[PDB]
Symmetry: C3
Subunit: 128 residues, 3 copies
C-alpha cells in the first residue's frame, strides 16, 4: 500500500464530537468513518490539527484506546490551534476529536479553515 | 526525483520580507528564488521555523496563494520561535516569510540561528 | 538500512539527565546508549518530546555538539510538554535530554507517559 495519509476538513461540532470530512484537495489513502480516521497500517504518524475556533475550546485528540486522549492547547491568542503530535498507530485505531463543553457551545461552535492531517512516517503491517 | 527538502538560513529582514539562504550544511533538493522556496513537486510537507528573534515579531508564513498566511506564534519568552506546520503544497507554490512591522524594526531585526526547513512527507506529481 | 526511528520512554531524572529507555511497543531501528539516542544515518529528523512533568521544568534537548541545545518550552498549564523539532542529524550525533535544576528536584521528578520520538524524514549516508 501507499504511504498512509488523510487531510480532512474539521467542519463543526455536534454532540461533543468534531466532524471530519475528506472533502479537501488531497489524495487520500485512508478512510473517514463516523467522523474518525480509520488506521489500516501500523506506523509512526504525525497528527496535525489547525483551525480558528471562535470559542476558547478544550478539544481532546483520541488516537488509541490504550492511551489517554491528548488535550489540545490553543495558541496564546485563545482563538487558534496549530498543534503537532507524533504517535504510534496500529490497525483498528480511530483518530477522532471531542469537545469538553456544554452542548450549546458545541452546536454553535464556528471553526474556520479547520483541518486534521494524519500522515504515516514509517512503514508497518497493513490489514488486508 | 528525490524526496523534496530544503533547510535554509533565515538571515535578516529587508522591506518586510525575511531573507532565506540555502547556505546550510544540508543536501538541498529544492531551489530558493528571491527569498522564496520554490515548490516543484506536490505533497504534504512539513514547514518548520526556528530562530531567536531580538524583537517581539509578527511573522507571516506564506505557502500557497489560495490560503491565508499563517501568523507564526512566538514561544512564551517572546524571544524564540520553534514552530511546525503541515501543509499541502503544489508546483508553483512559493514558501516565504514576511514581517508585519514598521520598516525600521525590520531593517534592524537580529535573527540568531534562524532556519526554515521544508520537507516532503508524501510523493506527488513533479513538474519537468 | 531501514528508515531510522526510535520511540523511547523518558522515565526519570538522575544527576541532571533524563533517562531514555527503548521499552516501548515500537519497532526500533536506532540504539539507546547511556540514555542517548545514537545516530547512525544522516538525515533530517523529527525529534518529538511528550510528557506530564510534575515540576515546572527547564529541559534542554541536545542533538548535535556544534549547535546549542534547545530549551524545551512547557505548555501553558506548566505541567505538560508536547514539543516538535526538525533537525539535521549525522553519524555520531547523540540525542539526549538534560535538566537545569537543583539535583533534589531532579531525583524527585515524576514523569508520566514521557516519550521521545526520533524519526528520519530524509535518507542519508549510514555508517557501517
Ligand atoms: C457514530 O459514532 C457514535 C460514537 O459516539 C455512535 O453514537 C454512533 O452509533 C456511531 N455510528 C456508527 C456505528 O456508525
Ligand atoms: C523579488 O520579490 C519582490 C516581491 O515583493 C519583488 O519586488 C521583486 O521584483 C522580486 N524580484 C524578482 C522578480 O526576482
Ligand atoms: C554515561 O554518561 C555520562 C555523561 O555525563 C558519563 O558520566 C558516564 O561516564 C557515561 N558512561 C559511559 C561512558 O557509558
Amino acid at each position: 500500500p501507499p504511504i498512509q495519509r488523510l487531510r480532512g476538513a474539521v467542519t463543526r461540532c455536534e454532540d461533543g464530537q468534531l466532524f471530519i470530512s475528506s472533502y479537501k484537495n488531497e489524495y487520500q489513502t485512508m478512510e473517514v468513518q463516523n467522523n474518525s480516521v480509520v488506521i489500516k497500517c501500523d506506523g509512526l504518524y504525525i497528527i496535525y490539527l489547525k483551525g480558528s475556533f471562535f470559542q476558547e475550546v478544550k478539544i481532546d485528540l483520541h488516537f488509541r484506546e490504550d492511551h489517554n486522549p491528548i488535550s489540545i492547547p490553543m495558541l496564546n491568542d485563545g482563538r487558534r490551534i496549530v498543534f503537532t503530535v507524533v504517535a504510534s498507530l496500529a490497525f483498528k485505531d480511530k483518530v477522532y476529536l471531542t469537545v469538553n463543553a456544554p452542548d450549546t457551545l458545541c452546536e454553535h461552535l464556528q471553526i474556520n479553515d479547520g483541518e486534521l492531517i494524519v500522515v504515516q512516517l514509517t512503514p508497518g503491517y497493513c490489514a488486508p
